[PDB]
Amino acid sequence: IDPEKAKSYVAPYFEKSEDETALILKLLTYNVLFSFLDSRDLMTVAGAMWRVEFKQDDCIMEAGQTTCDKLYIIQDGKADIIKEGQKVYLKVEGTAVGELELMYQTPTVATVKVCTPELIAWALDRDTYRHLVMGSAIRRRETYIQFLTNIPFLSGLDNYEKLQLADALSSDEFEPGDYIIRYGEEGEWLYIILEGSVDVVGRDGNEKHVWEFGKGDHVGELEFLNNHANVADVVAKTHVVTAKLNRRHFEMCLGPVIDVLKRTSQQPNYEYYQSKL
Ligand SMILES: O=c1[nH]cnc2c1ncn2[C@@H]1O[C@H](CO)[C@@H](O)[C@H]1O
Ligand SMILES: O=c1[nH]cnc2c1ncn2[C@@H]1O[C@H](CO)[C@@H](O)[C@H]1O
């Protein structure tokens, strides 16, 4: 995609009710594919979507076809991902199907079979997806996936899921002394430390040193798990490079390792954190 061609691309518009547009935007907001669009782009994308109904056992797309030039975001229902006759993944409400073929321009990798009495989805055509949504997804996936296969708490994600997490990550560089996370404030970001060291500075206020973390560790999830303001600062001790994830996408991206994060917070290195609770 030429950037100028993406700039001047006029998306189709398919009239729909205010209620349907609102429901679409809620789906686009939590789905990883759209994490970098601003409001006007989200509105345009929603205008280019149209509603599709499937009944149980329908194949939305079939492995090996080349004719499917669309993305589907699931509103209601579930679908099986079937490779070589085996169910290998389950797509639930709010997730998308078809993105791999739109990104990479290959034939349909897997068969997607509705396994609920009905499935209601919203479809998006190849050109709108490529011009308005894709952006630099392919570069983000290729960049981050080298680091993500070495992050301990992400072992519980399969390969497809690690790549999908890359869709919603964004990098930041910090300098010795920079506050990455600041006590008392609202948690919105989960940070993965790709390089450097950081200090967890708690309180009791009393400014008390809690723990030191480094390459491969994560910070910020405690506020996601338990919905409370930051119980501690996180301060760059060296130059730190991070990839971060917005709370929006916490469940969609890390669902399969949310249980590991719970265990981790019940370790002794969270004595400070246990006692505050
Ligand atoms: O390994 C997978 N894990 C999870 N979902 C997959 C996988 N492979 C494919 N899809 C889903 O099936 C669609 C059609 O091939 C893809 O676009 C993707 O949404
Ligand atoms: O007791 C602790 N031990 C280790 N890390 C902690 C502890 N408490 C908080 N954090 C880290 O600091 C962030 C801000 O609250 C938490 O989300 C977590 O990443």
Numbering used by the authors: 211 to 414, 417 to 489
Wording from the paper:
Cyclic nucleotide binding domains (CNB) confer allosteric regulation by cAMP or cGMP to many signaling proteins, including PKA and PKG. PKA of phylogenetically distant Trypanosoma is the first exception as it is cyclic nucleotide-independent and responsive to nucleoside analogues. Here, we show that natural nucleosides inosine, guanosine and adenosine are nanomolar affinity CNB ligands and activators of PKA orthologs of the important tropical pathogens Trypanosoma brucei, Trypanosoma cruzi, and Leishmania. Substitution of two to three amino acids in the binding sites is sufficient for conversion of CNB domains from nucleoside to cyclic nucleotide specificity.
To evaluate the binding mode, we solved the crystal structures of T. cruzi PKAR(200-503) and T. brucei PKAR(199-499) bound to inosine at 1.4 Å and 2.1 Å resolution, respectively. The structures of TbPKAR and TcPKAR show high overall similarity. (b) T. brucei PKAR(199-499) displayed as in A, Residues G308, E309, E311, and A320 are part of RBC-A while G432, E433, and E435 belong to RBC-B. Capping residues (Y370 and Y482) are marked with an asterisk. The glutamates in kinetoplastid RBCs interacts with the 3’ and 5’ OH groups of ribose. Moreover, the arginines 209/333PKARIα and the glutamates 311/435TbPKAR occupy the same spatial position in the structures. Y484 interacts with the backbone of V443 and R413 while Y485 forms two hydrogen bonds to the side chains of N438 and H440. The beta factor representation of TbPKAR suggests that proline 480 functions as a hinge between αC and αD, as the average displacement of P480 is higher than that of the other residues around it, likely correlating with higher mobility.
